[PDB]
Amino acid sequence: DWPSINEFLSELAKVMPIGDTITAACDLISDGEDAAASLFGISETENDPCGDVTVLFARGTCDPGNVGVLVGPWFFDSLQTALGSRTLGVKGVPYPASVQDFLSGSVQNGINMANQIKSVLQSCPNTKLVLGGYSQGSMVVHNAASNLDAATMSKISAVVLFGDPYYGKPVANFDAAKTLVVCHDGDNICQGGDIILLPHLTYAEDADTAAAFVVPLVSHHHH
């Protein structure tokens, strides 16, 4: 039902406003993602109950829904495949993913995500919780970790960030050995910029590698 990553990227190439700043590209990115989602049957909103593994995912600036189409869905499918029989529940982070918060620092969004993390840990104390972010969503994850103590962050199994605008900064109050940051060569966002270039839109290619990073970190008996 879903296309291959190659077919997915070729369809995006027809509409994505490559070379524009996020401000100039915002509405075209949102429309392009929505059109690809409708064409391919890819969900841009996730609100599952906790699974054996649960991912809290913060989407990119101007991405539709609560997970977008570019990266999140591919990462969830790869992770579910890598988990075999174990179930994966995905919950999108309900924040605006606005241009202004990207340009400012997305900080109250970090506090809200820190509350969502605390709430999921209380509601699902037996799930293996993984945090994921793309673009501004990676800033939200960084800010959530900055607002949590090391004892709470110790309850997180893994963190995966794609196209991190804070690339180079570690995830606060957390073991860096449990973090994977995927930042493509030539992605202007990872350089602290605001230009949307092709390397920022192709993180679906890293879904399998990101899933492989997570799997060893989500065992109930590996301490």
Catalytic residues: 135, 187, 200
Taking alpha carbons only, the member of 58, 143, 136 closest to residue 99 is 136
Taking alpha carbons only, the member of 4, 26, 6 closest to residue 16 is 26
**At residue 117, what is the residue type?**
I
Is 39 within 8 Å of 62 (Cβ atoms)?
no
Separation CA 60–CA 75 (nearest Å): 14
Q: CA-CA distances (angstroms) from residue 37 to 25, 77, 82, 102?
A: 18, 15, 23, 23
